[PDB]
Amino acid sequence: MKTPLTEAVSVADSQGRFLSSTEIQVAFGRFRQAKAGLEAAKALTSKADSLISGAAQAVYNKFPYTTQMQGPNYAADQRGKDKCARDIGYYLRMVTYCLIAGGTGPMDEYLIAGIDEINRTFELSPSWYIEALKYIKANHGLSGDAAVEANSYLDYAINALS
């Protein structure tokens, strides 16, 4: 994955080297950012259901035809609404994971890799998820490095979609 520690190790490993002061500095940064990120993920986990619900409703609000059009790729029926909610949940969960890890790694491994193929194969519009992510960004009620980092991940996911 992409995380300070694992990257710091993998680099040094690729060079056949013992960890130096550099990797130690990487770690030092990680462990201090952790103080905010770990609690950020907590706050976000606590507000999971609300954020997911509101985000899904926001998607439905901005793109109403998703609640009306027939087709397996829409939330016009219960099935699709649960699919939507599930996906938004996945996204939020990945964000928490990124906060836990201190890097985009989890999201990269679990979500970003192949997202284009999925969205294209099942006819899912990135704008929907961009909207959900926007809504989540505007409602998580975080502040400080928590907010900044979490939002960096949110913007990263938004970037992966656009």
């Binding site: 995380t3 520690l5 694992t6 960890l19 770690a27 993920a41 836990i100 890890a101 679990y110």
Partner: protein, 172 residues
């Protein structure tokens, strides 16, 4: 590989669950003692060559047939390989201490190693014995109260012994 964080993350991901607050507190607990962790990383790293060479020199004295003509450590090439093995094993342990997880050590270094020593006819038994001395010396080096803010580092030492033990056990 996994570190202390992504390990929990992945274990959680396979269930499809957010981290439990307790699981996160557990990690904050680790964060709270990370300076010590990096201290031992630095400390073991700073004495890599002596840790290796002392252990090796002592290993050869207890088992002189290894360096005896025909032994698996006779000739300078095999001796170099041997020292290299000691250093490698030592390195991948510091990786585990730094990462806070044994995944990298098992995955990249240990898994498939006894088979290597098998195909080579190398005495893994003696290798483990080398790892033991390296463990001892490293732990001694880590517990040095000189030139450092004093406090309890027993949990960490206990964690380190585990890595060294996994190394020693992997090739035995």
């Amino acid at each position: 590989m996994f570190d202390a964080f992504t390990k929990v993350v992945s274990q959680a991901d396979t269930r499809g669950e957010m981290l439990s607050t307790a699981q996160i507190d557990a990690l904050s607990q680790m964060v709270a003692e990370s300076n010590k962790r990096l201290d031992v990383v630095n400390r073991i790293t700073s004495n890599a060559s002596t840790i290796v060479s002392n252990a090796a020199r002592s290993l050869f004295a207890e088992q002189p047939q290894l360096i005896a003509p025909g032994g698996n450590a006779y000739t300078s090439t095999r001796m170099a390989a041997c020292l290299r093995d000691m250093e490698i094993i030592l390195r991948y342990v510091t990786y585990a201490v730094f990462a806070g997880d044994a995944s990298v050590l098992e995955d990249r270094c240990l898994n498939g190693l006894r088979e290597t020593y098998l195909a080579l006819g190398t005495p893994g038994s003696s290798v483990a014995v080398g790892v033991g001395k390296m463990k001892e010396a490293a732990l001694a080096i880590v517990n040095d109260p000189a030139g450092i803010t004093p406090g309890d580092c027993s949990a960490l030492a206990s964690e380190i012994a585990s890595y060294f033990d996994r190394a020693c056990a992997a090739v035995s």
